[PDB]
Amino acid sequence: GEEEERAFLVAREELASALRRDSGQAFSLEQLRPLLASSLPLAARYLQLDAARLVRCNAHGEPRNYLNTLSTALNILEKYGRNLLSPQRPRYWRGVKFNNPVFRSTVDAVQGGRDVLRLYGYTEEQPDGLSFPEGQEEPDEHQVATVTLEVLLLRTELSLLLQNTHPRQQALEQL
Amino acid sequence: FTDCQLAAAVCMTY
Ligand SMILES: *CC(=O)Nc1ccc(NC(=O)C*)cc1
Ligand SMILES: [N]
């Protein structure tokens, strides 16, 4: 019981370290197999992200549509975490503003998309968006890397469901 | 959207 969980968390920490080593690294489906072909429930596999809430609270309409709106939001949210791990961060990375057409159509189009930015470190609720606390001067690399991996893993899981090739497709379809 | 519209927009919200 705890051995399958241990093997998952070790593989999760290994893949999150590679993100810190290279923020632009792309992971193959083979590298994610320990994370993809796991019998553990969602709460044991997603420690930062709330995968069940992000999926069920956005499951409205056809799965062809809302799983795709979720994937696009997860895609752009992955880039937010990758830029934080980059050796040359963007100039104004400390704050994110919400009055953008792409942001409205991606992050603000899914329930709980803003809360993923909080997991990166954007905890200060600002007028136009979110920002880091005044104390921190740099993001927590381990926290950003683990959240970016979970965002990457969930987008992968949803993409395999859209292709009907998920290794545990029947279990995940029953949300 | 395309992958480059997403990355450019990320830098726009900063
Ligand atoms: C095609 C592609 O990779 N485009 C692209 C555009 C912009 C950015 N970055 C910023 O705007 C900060 C990266 C990639
Ligand atoms: N920005």
Three-state DSSP class for residue A38: coil
d(CA A31, CA A28): 5
Q: Give ligand 2 pocket residues (Cβ under 6 A).
A: A 92, 97; B 13-14
Among the listed residues A174, A175, A149, A138, the one whose alpha carbon sits nearest the alpha carbon of residue A36: A149
Resolution stated for this PDB structure, in Å:
2.5
Residue A23 is classified by DSSP as: T
Three-state DSSP class for residue A125: strand
Torsion, Cα of A118, A172, A19, A8 (10° steps): 110
Q: Solved by what technique?
A: X-ray
B contacts of A148 (beta carbons < 8 Å): none
CA A148 to chain centre: 5
**From the CA of A102, how far away is ligand 1's center (Å)?**
14
Torsion, Cα of A136, A142, A110, A163 (10° steps): 160
Among the listed residues A65, A30, A66, A70, the one whose alpha carbon sits nearest the alpha carbon of residue A49: A70
CA-nearest residue for atom 1, ligand 1, is B4
Question: In chain A, what's the furthest Cα-to-Cα distance?
Answer: 46
Residue A117 sits at φ, ψ, to 5 deg, of: -65, -30
Using N-to-C axis directions, what is the helix angle for B3-13 and A63-85, rounded to 10°? Answer: 60
d(CA A124, CA A118): 8
Among the listed residues A154, A140, A166, the one whose alpha carbon sits nearest the alpha carbon of residue A78: A154
Kindly state the tokens that stand for A145: 């890397």
d(CA A140, CA A86): 12
